[PDB]
Symmetry: none
């Protein structure tokens, strides 16, 4: 005679913390920005950004994958 | 005689915390921005941005996946 | 006669912590920025950024993978 | 002339979470209880209890008081 | 002329968490209890209990008092 | 002229966490108990308990007080 007791217990935790988290009393200060542009000639496509402060979180990465598998073969 | 007691317990926890979280006292300062553009010539497509402050939390990455698979067999 | 008891207990705590976490009392200061441009001549595709301060957290790296596999057999 | 703008904002949050809350997986097991009493004598008040399991969650204490006083005086 | 602006803002928490909260996978196991009582004599008040498991979460504390006062006097 | 601005901001977080919080895998065991009371004799008040396991979480003390007081005066 045979018994199989198959009782995996999984309490595991898979946590991603990403970006600007738990930060306190930040005062990021952009200075003055002055742009003079005169008589400039562009023969082709232009991409431009101007500004005193960029404050940015970009988070492509959080990305948890859990793969879990439980085979029991009695043949 | 045969007994199989297939009783996994899953209490596991997959969690993603992405971007800006729990940030307690921020005062981002946009500076003054001045742009003077004169007699500029563009032959082709222009893309532009102007501003004192950008305050951006872009998150492509929340990203959780969980694959789980139970497979008893008795043949 | 045969008994198999298969009681794995998983309490694992796979954690990622990326970017600006738990920072206190920053005052990042951008200086004044002055750009003079006159009579420039661009023959091909242009990309430009001007600004006093960049305060950026870019995080592609959260990235948790857990692969877990149980495989009992009785042939 | 005199102007008084008395506009206090209350958004504050008193809260009590007393007792047995959010407890996920529990299986309290009472055991076998056997009592044999013979030839006993009790000349005064008896109070008694017998049982395998008590799961009591008595909460006398969880109350709030939130006294608030406002007074504007112009004598 | 006189201006008084009186705009206190309260967003504060006053939280009590008391007793038995957020617990996981508990299995308290009372054992066998056997009582033999023979020929016992009690001349005064008896208060008695028998049992394998007391899973009791008594909370007679955990209350809150918030007292708040706002006096503006213009005498 | 006289201008008084009175803007106290409260973001505070008075918090109590008392008793058995966030425990993850307890299996408290009670042993077998066997009591052989024979021929005993009690002339005065008896208070008694028998049992394998107490899992008691008494919280008589976890309370909060926040006392808060604003006074503005113009004599």
């Amino acid at each position: 005679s045979v018994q199989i007791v198959y009782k995996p217990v999984d309490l595991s935790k898979v946590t991603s913390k990403c970006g600007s988290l738990g930060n306190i009393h930040h005062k990021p200060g952009g200075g003055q920005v002055e742009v003079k542009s005169e008589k400039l000639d562009f023969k082709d496509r232009v991409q431009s950004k101007i500004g005193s402060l960029d404050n940015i979180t970009h988070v492509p990465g959080g990305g948890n994958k859990k793969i879990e598998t439980h085979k029991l073969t009695f043949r």
